[PDB]
Design a protein around this ligand. Structure first.
Ligand SMILES: [Mg+2]
Ligand SMILES: [Mg+2]
Ligand SMILES: [Mg+2]
Ligand SMILES: [Mg+2]
Ligand SMILES: [Mg+2]
Ligand SMILES: [Mg+2]
Lengths: 52, 52, 147, 187, 134, 129, 52, 122
RNA sequence: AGAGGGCGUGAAACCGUUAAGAGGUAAACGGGUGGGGUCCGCGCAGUCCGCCCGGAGGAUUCAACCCGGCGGCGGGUCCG
RNA sequence: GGCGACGUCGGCUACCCACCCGACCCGUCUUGAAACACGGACCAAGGAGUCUAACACGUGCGCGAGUCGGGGGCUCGCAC
């Protein structure tokens, strides 16, 4: 009645189900991937507050 | 009384919203965070047999 | 949505967004297209040039069906049939050219627009342009006419 | 007072999309990590293109892409477009190129996948090339709309070529004086 | 839930049909339940109250096991008067305070030829409700 | 002080004087609620001296000291037990209020749940017998 | 695509031997901005014109 | 999908209190009652929660099973712990960090457990 | 009856009264302190609270270690 | 480091009063209003940029060389 993504809906004449804008949607796994973190700089983790 | 009371939505958006309305009723977090106390229930797309 | 609009944000200010001096009254310039030659002239040239006068022949009771001909030019010419035809068309079977009649697709005239591919055709239309027939006669195709 | 002049304080670009798409908002969060952290300028171009409007994201047809990838050097790169890939009827056969885009249309991704190519989203682009190495990022004709041929000097100035707003094309609709030297003048 | 599209569900039109009621509808709407002894002997739930029923009051200021007959049924004020529950005025004359018949339980019906025919018809129409369970 | 709330600073406030509407003294049709004067000639908008001040963002209070009560907490008004328990990990920073509709029976119970959890209630002895 | 199996529960609460595959509706894009856009617009087709 | 379930519930949900100030999340399974992305007990594969014991003697520790989501009758496995006020505070921190089961929110599991045990002391 | 026959609630303008304060530059207001007053909070030279350690006696039982035992975490031939 | 109990300590608002300094009455048209320019004795409730059509441009969403059922039609006789 809504069809999978291989085959269209049968009881609805010209409808197939809407595609995704993101495939992998858990980006806590993407940003911890070795492909990503091979490429990053380093965190810059001082504060450098105002100096009198 | 000739105010435009009634609104059109083109039907691929009606079917877009009805696939997004069914797919969130399978995630236990979204259906419990709408308030439905679904703690003790088993498997989230509940299917009882056709004898019901 | 009366919430999201300008008059809520403009409520409390005296002149309501229309000026202390000009003080929007009813119809300061005339109603409608008034002054189209006289005091709105600078607007009617520079934005509507040509707007005043006779230009042509009067034609009483034209009927918008006698002059009816939709056009398909040669780039869109192959989508009238299957893509299953032209891949079947070129598989070494002789020069057997498929038919494409635009009149059962709802078109009458075949115009020119470049890159007609290398296969021979026969094209059934009510009308043709001469650029279009010499694209078709250049790929070895034919150009058969129908009433 | 100082006299350092006004209007230099404010810039009028976009810092987040105005969309409420929760799938575009996670693509934003992925790339504004990568923009401020990996030091490659591909990820700054793609990040500010995700912020852009729908008019600033024009559709890119199937034969602008494969005409812009018959060039020498582009033989094994991937095509990025932030926006849709429609398909041309004009093109007859499709090469096996690798594309990457928001929202490829249905008939286009039947022709890319028959050709043997691979379609990607911006997730699995980021896993593939985080620096954006070996990508050809394309755009559609953003001044190809029907609106931009109405803009210019004026339709009634000398050599305007501006296409005025008439309600219906035909005889006696904005064609009489100012448009021919017999009736009045010609601009 | 109401399905019949010819009968009301608004507040304002059901009140207006209540206080402007005809006096033969008004005896129907002033009905009272039978006692638990007596609804088993007649297998009928409730009855429209008349002039010499023995009756006791089940809620209110005057309540609790005080069988005593009605004496006057105001339909216009939706009120029965019972011979025992009264009220002394400031004058010292005693008057009947009036109570609504929904708050009141018949303990002995007054049978006549018609109160046989009303009970028998209200009781016969319950066995067909039992005969539907097949 | 029944309870002590972590670090309480010196609460400075820039003004303690409750901005009033112009001409609110002279009439009683005019409430004292602030409405900024948009007349073309008046001397409050044009900001002469010795007259009624008009609020601007410079009078804003310090961000680390904003919404601080004089006791050092910040109020969070509740209605029952089930939303008193949400303030359990905030009890040295925030304080509870009982809303003005909560009956004297239930108000008696949600202050005894407050004393077990050691959360400051600002109005513990309200609507007693 | 990941389409798991879902047990059909009997009338007495426990499972049965029937296990239906999750149809592809439940892996659609979740879009609460379209569902807001549709439910705003289709609840307005529901109303009598004003007592003008 | 810990993030897209977050971007529905972020605002615009039940279990969400906003009064005059701070926002609260009042979840069944949430240590520190903030509506944080970490501190949400519906949206994660792994969650930690410490409710008081039913009688008023101890702490229960609900954790998420991970053996199957989408099936919430058996999604939670809970342990009542009734020990002597630092070995129940040490027992629930071995349950966090001897496992790799969210080293995040380790102190928030023991700030909550310590402040819920002295809710029981008289 | 603080619901007493145009009687639910009973605002303001206005007026009576009592209380307090004051009064030849008409009153009113801004800013700054002061004096009185109503009232609150603390409770009144009686205020700190929880952390660890060493002191002083008391009162109980686990921990460490092992065994029984169910339940979860993570890795593995992807073995079924 | 020092100081203080049953009347004292602290506190502030739409409390009242005092004093020094500053201070003409609002709205409005206007080059210019405190104006010997007009409106306003006072209070309460009411009270003024709406809705429909057309168009332009920006923006958001669906599909995308296409798009669109609005007009009808079908679905057991269904509160919504
Ligand atoms: Mg203005
Ligand atoms: Mg304006
Ligand atoms: Mg004007
Ligand atoms: Mg009605
Ligand atoms: Mg001026
Ligand atoms: Mg003036």
């Amino acid at each position: 009645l809504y069809g999978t993504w291989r085959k269209a809906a049968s009881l609805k004449s010209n409808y197939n189900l809407p595609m995704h804008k993101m495939i992998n949607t858990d980006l806590s796994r993407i940003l911890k991937s070795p492909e990503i973190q091979r490429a990053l700089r380093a965190p810059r983790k001082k504060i450098h507050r105002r100096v009198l | 009384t000739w105010r435009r009371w009634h609104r059109r939505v083109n039907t691929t958006q009606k079917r877009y919203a009805i696939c997004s309305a069914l797919a969130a009723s399978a995630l236990p977090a979204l259906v419990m965070s709408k308030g439905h106390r679904i703690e003790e229930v088993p498997e989230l797309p509940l299917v009882v047999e056709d004898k019901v | 949505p009366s919430r999201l609009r300008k008059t809520r944000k403009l409520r409390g200010h005296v002149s309501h967004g229309h000026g202390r001096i000009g003080k929007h009254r009813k119809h300061p310039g005339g109603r409608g297209n008034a002054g189209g030659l006289h005091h709105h002239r600078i607007n009617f040239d520079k934005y509507h040039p040509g707007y005043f006068g006779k230009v042509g022949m009067k034609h009483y009771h034209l009927k918008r069906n006698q002059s009816f001909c939709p056009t398909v030019n040669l780039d869109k010419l192959w989508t009238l049939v299957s893509e299953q035809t032209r891949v079947n068309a070129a598989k070494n079977k002789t020069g057997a050219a498929p038919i494409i009649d635009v009149v059962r697709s709802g078109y009458y005239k075949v115009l020119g627009k470049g890159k007609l591919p290398k296969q021979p055709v026969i094209v059934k239309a009510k009308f043709f342009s001469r650029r279009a027939e010499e694209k078709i006669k250049s790929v070895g195709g034919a150009c058969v006419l129908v009433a | 007072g100082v006299d350092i002049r006004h209007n230099k304080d404010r810039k009028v670009r976009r810092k987040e999309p105005k969309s409420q798409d929760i799938y575009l908002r996670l693509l934003v969060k992925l790339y504004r990590f990568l923009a401020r952290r990996t030091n490659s300028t591909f990820n700054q171009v793609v990040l500010k293109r995700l912020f852009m409007s729908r008019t600033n994201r024009p559709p890119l047809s199937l034969s602008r892409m494969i005409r812009k990838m018959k060039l020498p050097g582009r033989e094994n790169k991937t095509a990025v477009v932030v926006g849709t890939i429609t398909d041309d009827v004009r093109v007859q056969e499709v090469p096996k190129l690798k594309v990457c885009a928001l929202r490829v249309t249905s008939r286009a991704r039947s022709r890319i996948l028959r050709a043997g190519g691979k379609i990607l989203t911006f997730d699995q682009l980021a896993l593939d090339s985080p620096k954006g190495c070996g990508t050809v990022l394309l755009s559609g004709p953003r001044k190809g709309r029907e609106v931009y041929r109405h803009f210019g000097k004026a339709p009634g100035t000398p050599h305007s070529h501006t296409k005025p707003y008439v309600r219906s094309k035909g005889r006696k609709f904005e064609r009489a004086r100012g448009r021919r030297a017999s009736r009045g003048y010609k601009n | 839930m109401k399905f019949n599209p010819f009968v009301t569900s608004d507040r304002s039109k059901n009140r207006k049909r209540h206080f402007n009621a005809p006096s033969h509808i008004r005896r129907k709407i002033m009905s009272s339940p039978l006692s638990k002894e007596l609804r088993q002997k007649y297998n009928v739930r409730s009855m429209p109250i008349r002039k010499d029923d023995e009756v006791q009051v089940v809620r209110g200021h005057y309540k609790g096991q005080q069988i005593g007959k009605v004496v006057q049924v105001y339909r216009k004020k939706y009120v029965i008067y019972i011979e025992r529950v009264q009220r002394e005025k400031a004058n010292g004359t005693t008057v009947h305070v009036g109570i609504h018949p929904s708050k009141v339980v018949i303990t002995r019906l007054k049978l006549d030829k018609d109160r046989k025919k009303i009970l028998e018809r209200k009781a016969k129409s319950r066995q067909v409700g039992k005969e539907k369970g097949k | 002080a029944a309870l002590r709330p972590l670090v309480k600073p010196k609460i400075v406030k820039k003004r303690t004087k409750k901005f009033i509407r112009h001409q609110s003294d002279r009439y009683v049709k005019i409430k004292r609620n602030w409405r900024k004067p948009r007349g073309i000639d008046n001397r409050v908008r044009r900001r002469f001296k010795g007259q009624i001040l008009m609020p601007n963002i410079g009078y804003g209070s310090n961000k680390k000291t904003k919404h601080m009560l004089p006791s050092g907490f910040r109020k969070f008004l509740v209605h029952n037990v089930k939303e008193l328990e949400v303030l359990l990990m905030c009890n040295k920073s925030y304080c509870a209020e009982i809303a003005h509709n909560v009956s004297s029976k239930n108000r008696k119970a949600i202050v005894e749940r407050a004393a077990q959890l050691a959360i400051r209630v600002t109005n513990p002895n309200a609507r007693l017998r | 695509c990941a389409r798991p199996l879902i047990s059909v529960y009997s009338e007495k609460g426990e499972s049965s031997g029937k296990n239906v595959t999750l149809p592809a509706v439940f892996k659609a894009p979740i879009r609460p901005d379209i569902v807001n856009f549709v439910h705003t617009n289709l609840r307005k087709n529901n109303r009598q014109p004003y007592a003008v | 999908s810990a993030h897209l379930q977050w971007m529905v519930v972020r605002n615009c949900s039940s279990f969400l209190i906003k009064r005059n100030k701070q926002t609260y999340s009042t979840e069944p399974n949430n240590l520190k009652a903030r509506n944080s992305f970490r501190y949400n007990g519906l949206i994660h594969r792994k969650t930690v929660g410490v409710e008081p014991a039913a009688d008023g003697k101890g702490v229960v520790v609900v954790i998420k099973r991970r053996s199957g989501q989408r099936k919430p009758a058996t999604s939670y496995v809970r342990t009542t712990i009734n020990k002597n006020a630092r070995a129940t505070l040490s027992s629930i921190r071995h349950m966090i960090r001897k496992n790799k089961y969210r080293p995040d929110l380790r102190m928030a599991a023991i700030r909550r457990a310590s402040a819920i045990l002295r809710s029981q002391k008289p």
